[PDB]
Structure formats: C-alpha cells, structure tokens
Amino acid sequence: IPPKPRKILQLLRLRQINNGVFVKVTKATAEMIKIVEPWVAYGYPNLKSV
C-alpha cells in the first residue's frame, strides 16, 4: 500500500480488514474516502444498519 492511502486509512481508523467506521460527509472527508476507494467499500447506512 502506498504511504498516502496508508496514512488516510490510519486517520480513518481502518487498520484491519473488515473494520468499519461512521463518517460525517464533508468535502474534507469525501476527498479522503475518494483517495482510499481502492481499499474500502462505503455507502449510506439506514436506521436498521445503525
């Protein structure tokens, strides 16, 4: 993994495979997630999921 996606995953607290986090949508977070798209799957969770 390249150092910038490694650092972004470290800041998103995704250090292990099948770890999941809740993220509030801003530009500052959306750009990070767009960079680490080759390692993560993300989407919009509903009330049942939460």
Partner 1 sequence: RTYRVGDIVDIKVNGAVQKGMPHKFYHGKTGVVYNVTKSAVGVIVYKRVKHRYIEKRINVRIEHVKPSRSREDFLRRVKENAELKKKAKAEGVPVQLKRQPAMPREAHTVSIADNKPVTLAPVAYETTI
Partner 2 sequence: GIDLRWKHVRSSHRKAPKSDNVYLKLLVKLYRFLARRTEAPFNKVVLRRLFMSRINRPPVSLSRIARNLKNGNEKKTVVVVATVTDDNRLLQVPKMEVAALRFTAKARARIEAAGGRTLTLDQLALEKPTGANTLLLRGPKNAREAVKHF
Partner RNA sequence: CGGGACCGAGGACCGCGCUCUGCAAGGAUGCUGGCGUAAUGGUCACCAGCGACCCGUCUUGAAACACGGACCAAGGAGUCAA
Partner RNA sequence: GACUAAUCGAACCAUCUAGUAGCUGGUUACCGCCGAAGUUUCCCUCAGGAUAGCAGUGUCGACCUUCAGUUUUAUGAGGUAAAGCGAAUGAACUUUAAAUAUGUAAGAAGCCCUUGUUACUUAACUGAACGUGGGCAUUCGAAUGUAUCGACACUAGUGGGCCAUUUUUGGUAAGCAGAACUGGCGAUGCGGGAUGAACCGAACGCGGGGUUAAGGUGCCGGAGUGGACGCUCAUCAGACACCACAAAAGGCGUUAGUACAUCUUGACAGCAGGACGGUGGCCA
Partner RNA sequence: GGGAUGGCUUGUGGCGGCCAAGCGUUCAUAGCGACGUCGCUUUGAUCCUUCGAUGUCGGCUCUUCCUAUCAUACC
How far, in Å, CA of 4 to CA of 9, rounded? 9
How far, in Å, CA of 39 to CA of 1, rounded? 9
x/- mask, partner 2, residues 3-22, rule CB under 8 A, reads ---x--xx----xx------
Total residues binding partner 2 (CB under 8 A): 5
How far, in Å, CA of 38 to CA of 18, rounded? 14
In the list partner 2, RNA, partner 1, none, the entry touching 15 (Cβ below 5 to 8 angstroms by class) is partner 2
Closest contact distance (angstroms) between CB of 12 and partner 1 is 16
